[PDB]
C-alpha cells in the first residue's frame, strides 16, 4: 500500500542521516537542513508560503541543537509540505 | 529521490480522505482512524510498545473532534512508527 511504503521510506531517511554517528534516535538541526537540502531537492514554496518558508529555513541554519527527534524530523516534513505542497496553497 | 516521492503520497492519502467533503483540509479522528486502519493494515505494535499504541488507538476511537489538519495526521504516522516500526524499539 502506497502510504506503508512512504512512511517507511520517510524512517529509511531518518536512520540514513540519525545513524551517522551518536546518538541513533537524534538529528542536530544542521543535520536537518542537510536532510532537506539533499532529499527534497526541487521543492519550492508556493506563491504565498515564500516568507514562512524562509523563516522555517533559517532557523535551522542559524540553530544549533541537537534534540531533533524523529517526530521533529516528521513535523518539519509536513510543514515543507504545507510551503511547497499545491495542495495547501490556500491553506490558512 | 525516494523521500520527494514518499512526502508526495503522503499528502495523497490525506487529499484522499480529507476531500470526501467539507473542508479540504481537516479530517475528523473518525476519518483518521478509517485512514490509519485501512491505510497501514499490516502495521502492528512492537514489543514495548503495545500500551502505548493501544492508548493511541482508543483516543481517535473515543475523540470526535474534527479539527486534525495535516500536521496532525503526519504526527499521527510518526505515532505509528515510534509504535510499529522495529528502528525504534528501543527508543
Not at 8 to 27: P, S, W
Not at 28 to 34: R, S, V
Not at 52 to 73: A, G, H, I, Q, R
Request: charged residues 30%; negative net charge; contains cysteine.
Amino acid at each position: 500500500r502506497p502510504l506503508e511504503q512512504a512512511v517507511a521510506a520517510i524512517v529509511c531517511t531518518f536512520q540514513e542521516y540519525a545513524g551517522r554517528c551518536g546518538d541513533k534516535y537524534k538529528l542536530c538541526q544542521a543535520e536537518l537542513k542537510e536532510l532537506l537540502q539533499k532529499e527534497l531537492a526541487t521543492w519550492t514554496p508556493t506563491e504565498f508560503a515564500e516568507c514562512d518558508y524562509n523563516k522555517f529555513m533559517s532557523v535551522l541554519d542559524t540553530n544549533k541543537d541537537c534534540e531533533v527527534d524523529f517526530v521533529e524530523y516528521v513535523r518539519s516534513l509536513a510543514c515543507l509540505c504545507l510551503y511547497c505542497h499545491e495542495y495547501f496553497k490556500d491553506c490558512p
